Design a protein around this motif. Structure first.
Motif, PDB file in Angstrom:
ATOM      1  N   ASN A  87       7.764   4.744  12.667  1.00  0.00           N
ATOM      2  CA  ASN A  87       7.275   3.378  13.321  1.00  0.00           C
ATOM      3  C   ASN A  87       8.884   2.938  14.019  1.00  0.00           C
ATOM      4  N   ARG A  88       9.433   3.078  12.734  1.00  0.00           N
ATOM      5  CA  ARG A  88      10.875   1.971  12.662  1.00  0.00           C
ATOM      6  C   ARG A  88      11.352   3.060  13.117  1.00  0.00           C
ATOM      7  N   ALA A  89      11.533   4.743  12.739  1.00  0.00           N
ATOM      8  CA  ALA A  89      12.005   5.656  13.508  1.00  0.00           C
ATOM      9  C   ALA A  89      12.269   5.817  15.360  1.00  0.00           C
ATOM     10  N   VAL A  90      11.112   5.610  15.556  1.00  0.00           N
ATOM     11  CA  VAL A  90      10.450   5.580  17.186  1.00  0.00           C
ATOM     12  C   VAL A  90      11.142   4.215  17.366  1.00  0.00           C
ATOM     13  N   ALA A  91      10.647   3.569  17.487  1.00  0.00           N
ATOM     14  CA  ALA A  91      11.199   1.991  17.454  1.00  0.00           C
ATOM     15  C   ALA A  91      12.579   1.537  18.075  1.00  0.00           C
ATOM     16  N   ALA A  92      13.448   2.722  16.360  1.00  0.00           N
ATOM     17  CA  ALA A  92      15.165   2.435  16.808  1.00  0.00           C
ATOM     18  C   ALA A  92      15.853   3.497  17.714  1.00  0.00           C
ATOM     19  N   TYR A 140      -0.195   9.998  17.796  1.00  0.00           N
ATOM     20  CA  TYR A 140      -0.473   9.120  19.141  1.00  0.00           C
ATOM     21  C   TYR A 140      -0.155   6.885  18.650  1.00  0.00           C
ATOM     22  N   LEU A 141      -0.492   7.261  17.227  1.00  0.00           N
ATOM     23  CA  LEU A 141      -0.558   6.115  16.772  1.00  0.00           C
ATOM     24  C   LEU A 141       0.742   5.943  16.270  1.00  0.00           C
ATOM     25  N   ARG A 146       0.729  -1.047   0.074  1.00  0.00           N
ATOM     26  CA  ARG A 146      -0.089  -0.089   0.144  1.00  0.00           C
ATOM     27  C   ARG A 146       0.502   1.395  -0.269  1.00  0.00           C
ATOM     28  N   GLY A 147       2.373   1.512  -0.398  1.00  0.00           N
ATOM     29  CA  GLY A 147       3.563   1.896   0.012  1.00  0.00           C
ATOM     30  C   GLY A 147       2.998   3.982  -0.195  1.00  0.00           C
ATOM     31  N   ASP A 148       2.353   4.206  -1.241  1.00  0.00           N
ATOM     32  CA  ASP A 148       1.972   5.088  -1.619  1.00  0.00           C
ATOM     33  C   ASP A 148       0.227   6.243  -0.803  1.00  0.00           C
ATOM     34  N   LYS A 149      -0.771   4.680  -0.765  1.00  0.00           N
ATOM     35  CA  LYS A 149      -1.781   4.889  -0.636  1.00  0.00           C
ATOM     36  C   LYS A 149      -1.659   4.959   1.060  1.00  0.00           C
ATOM     37  N   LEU A 150      -2.572   6.546   1.308  1.00  0.00           N
ATOM     38  CA  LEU A 150      -2.981   6.904   2.794  1.00  0.00           C
ATOM     39  C   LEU A 150      -3.334   5.511   3.734  1.00  0.00           C
ATOM     40  N   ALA A 151      -2.547   6.041   5.007  1.00  0.00           N
ATOM     41  CA  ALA A 151      -3.265   4.789   6.462  1.00  0.00           C
ATOM     42  C   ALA A 151      -3.922   5.670   7.668  1.00  0.00           C
ATOM     43  N   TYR A 152      -3.339   6.955   7.199  1.00  0.00           N
ATOM     44  CA  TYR A 152      -4.272   7.685   8.939  1.00  0.00           C
ATOM     45  C   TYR A 152      -5.168   8.785   7.936  1.00  0.00           C
ATOM     46  N   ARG A 153      -5.696   8.965   9.138  1.00  0.00           N
ATOM     47  CA  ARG A 153      -6.054  10.202   8.812  1.00  0.00           C
ATOM     48  C   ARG A 153      -6.876  11.225  10.283  1.00  0.00           C
ATOM     49  N   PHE A 154      -6.394  12.232  10.605  1.00  0.00           N
ATOM     50  CA  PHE A 154      -6.578  12.969  12.054  1.00  0.00           C
ATOM     51  C   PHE A 154      -7.240  14.473  10.577  1.00  0.00           C
ATOM     52  N   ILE A 156      -8.379   0.178  19.927  1.00  0.00           N
ATOM     53  CA  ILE A 156      -8.633  -0.992  18.993  1.00  0.00           C
ATOM     54  C   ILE A 156      -9.582  -1.562  17.645  1.00  0.00           C
ATOM     55  N   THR A 157     -10.046   0.300  17.949  1.00  0.00           N
ATOM     56  CA  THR A 157     -11.114   0.768  16.236  1.00  0.00           C
ATOM     57  C   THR A 157     -10.033   1.785  15.508  1.00  0.00           C
ATOM     58  N   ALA A 158      -8.683   1.840  15.780  1.00  0.00           N
ATOM     59  CA  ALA A 158      -7.955   2.810  15.015  1.00  0.00           C
ATOM     60  C   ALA A 158      -7.260   1.634  15.365  1.00  0.00           C
ATOM     61  N   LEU A 159      -7.058   0.565  15.775  1.00  0.00           N
ATOM     62  CA  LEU A 159      -5.793  -0.407  15.379  1.00  0.00           C
ATOM     63  C   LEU A 159      -6.556  -1.338  14.058  1.00  0.00           C
TER      64      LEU A 159
END
Length: 598
Positions: A53-58, A80-81, A22-30, A223-226
């Protein structure tokens, strides 16, 4: 067949796989309702999503040890997500919490941090000083490192290492629910299982939209967001504050957007529907509103009123809103979210049962116009691969359909216990059902399986599950049982001075009642210090002369129920104790009455 994931399977990798496709597709919208006038779609793509996610994880992996707990203190945002998923990516334990600059109530958050002792804190640059000032109130000995998630560079993702494959016992995150706080231990298995339980129950097609304003620190909101990143699909959300101020925002998002494929899916508590009914109807100078597309809007986390359903459909029906759209649902944090919901093709089922027999434990239908009738709305059918049974708490034996008992739940989605509370964990999460009955609502589950005591009274009727409410909130006075919601409904309908759904009904031992009550003639009880008997108290907020108001309430409850109200306490609006989710704390309100307030 039924929820068996292959070995080595993990969520971090699953979302990453979707992230590649889904690379260039939309994931979350705020939707940002802040200083901007109306709406600012803030978007996060799958590529951006995975990258952060990977950056914060590192950074988490360098500053935290495995098995450590990571608290998320953020307002509702993309970060938050990014912070939650980051915790999963790092291989740490997420602990969803809220912004300490929230309107008071951040004293309660001290207590939560006391339970889990987080090693690190994730926040945003906006809320960071607030977190700093907050922790300044705590001793220096406990002062975990604070990382602003939006401030972490994307280039740090380079040093990220994928954590080891999870096992059946690995804790994913701690879901805190509502005197000492209880974190529920939710494994990665619980997370993936319930997500699967929900999706199968929703019957979501590939054209549907989804949305929620619910807070992520709430199990219903989290969970609704997850849900979306694990299905491939996008998810759009706003802040709860945005909904309360202009409930029309939610309906507009529910309403058919121009040129979409499917219907909208959402969830919200019962009181929100009433909220959306009064203030959420569009003004006459607004563009047309078409609600016909809505597929399912789930109603849960609190007891659902037939009035709210009738009021809501009456309000948004003319805009094309289908009556089968409202989907009553039941669930708790011990199931991580979801237990049962109304089937997707069906109308919400609301019944009316005999009041006196309900208090005796029997579920028996009666005509709605009957003087002893209490409306009861079904929570529908139990979710897939999980079981709910009605039990005799004392005898641990399954009860027949139609009779009320404590609800027990069992399934792979069930948590493994409460964090740091070993004794309570065993009593609640480890119970075996000693005896089954004729059509055994536990059928399909092993004879050796653990059941979780939900702490709720309920019953099965004509194929649907009904929740009569909590055992802890039950009002026993002088030998007869009363359900508290029933009393407060009769109370609020007695006087129009009572803000709606601002009332709390409970019982207090006569010796504990305040001196004022005995000095009051109209009570009907006199002061004996040796009297340990429970007496009814009703507390209610005053919507925007106590004597007549109290008497009307006293009279109406006395006539419909057969109990005498000893004290009626009217407070200012917003005074009554509530909880994270916005629901009334019953027993907590009782305490507030006994320790005295204003």
């Amino acid at each position: 067949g039924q929820i068996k994931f292959p070995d080595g399977s993990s969520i971090v990798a699953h979302v990453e796989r979707w992230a590649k496709v889904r690379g260039d597709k939309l994931a979350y919208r705020f939707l940002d309702f802040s200083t901007e006038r109306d709406g600012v779609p803030r978007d996060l793509t799958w590529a951006q999503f995975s990258a952060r996610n990977r950056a914060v994880a590192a950074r988490l992996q360098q500053v935290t040890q495995p098995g450590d707990r990571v608290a998320i203190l953020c307002p509702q945002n993309l970060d938050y997500l990014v912070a939650f998923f980051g915790a999963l990516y790092a291989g740490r334990i997420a602990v969803p919490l809220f912004d300490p600059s929230e309107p008071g109530h951040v004293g309660r958050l001290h207590a939560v941090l006391d339970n889990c002792h987080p090693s690190a804190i994730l926040t945003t640059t906006e809320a960071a000083e607030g977190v700093r000032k907050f922790f300044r109130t705590r001793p220096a000995n406990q002062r975990p490192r604070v990382i602003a998630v939006d401030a972490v560079p994307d280039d740090v993702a380079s040093t990220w290492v994928n954590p080891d494959e999870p096992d059946e016992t690995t804790i994913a995150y701690l879901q805190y629910t509502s005197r000492i706080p209880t974190g529920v231990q939710i494994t990665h298995l619980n997370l993936a299982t319930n997500v699967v339980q929900v999706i199968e129950a929703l019957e979501g097609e590939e054209g549907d939209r989804g949305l929620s304003w619910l807070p992520f620190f709430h199990d219903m909101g989290l969970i609704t967001a997850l849900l979306a990143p694990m299905i491939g699909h996008y998810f759009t959300f706003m802040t709860p504050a945005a909904f309360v101020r202009r409930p029309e925002r939610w309906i507009r998002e529910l309403a058919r957007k121009e040129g979409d494929t499917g219907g909208t899916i959402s969830v919200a508590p019962n009181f929100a529907f009433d909220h959306a009914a009064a203030r959420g109807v569009p003004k006459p100078g607004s563009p047309p509103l078409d609600l016909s597309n809505v597929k399912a809007v789930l109603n849960g986390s609190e007891p659902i009123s037939a009035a709210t359903v009738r009021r809501f459909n009456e309000a948004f029906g003319p805009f094309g809103f289908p009556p089968k759209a409202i989907k009553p649902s039941y669930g708790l944090a011990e199931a991580t979210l979801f237990v049962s919901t109304t089937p997707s093709a069906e109308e919400p089922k609301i019944i009316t049962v005999d009041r006196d027999q309900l208090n005796s434990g029997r579920i028996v239908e009666v005509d709605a116009d009957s003087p002893k009738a209490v409306a009861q709305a079904s929570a529908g059918k139990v979710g897939i691969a999980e079981w709910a049974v009605i039990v005799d708490a004392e005898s641990a034996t399954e009860l027949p359909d139609g009779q009320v008992g404590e609800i027990w739940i069992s399934g792979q989605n069930m948590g493994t216990g409460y964090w740091g509370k070993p004794e309570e964990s065993v009593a609640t999460f480890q119970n075996i059902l000693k005896s089954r009955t004729n059509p055994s609502h536990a059928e399909g589950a092993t004879d050796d399986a653990t059941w979780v005591r939900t702490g709720d009274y309920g019953a099965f009727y004509d194929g649907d599950l009904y929740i009569t409410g909590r055992v802890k909130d039950l009002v026993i006075i002088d030998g007869r049982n009363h359900y508290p919601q029933d009393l407060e409904y009769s109370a609020q309908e007695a006087s129009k001075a009572i803000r709606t759904g601002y009332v709390a009904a409970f019982s207090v031992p006569a010796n504990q009642l305040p001196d004022e009550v005995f000095e009051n003639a109209h009570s009907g009880i006199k002061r004996d210090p040796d009297d340990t008997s429970e007496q009814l108290v009703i507390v209610a907020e005053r919507a925007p002369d106590i004597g007549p108001i109290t008497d009307d309430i006293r009279a109406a409850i006395a006539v419909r129920h057969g109990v005498t109200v000893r004290d009626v306490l009217l407070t200012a609006a917003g005074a009554i104790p509530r909880t994270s989710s916005g629901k009334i704390g019953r027993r907590a309100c009782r305490a507030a009455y006994l320790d005295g307030s204003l």
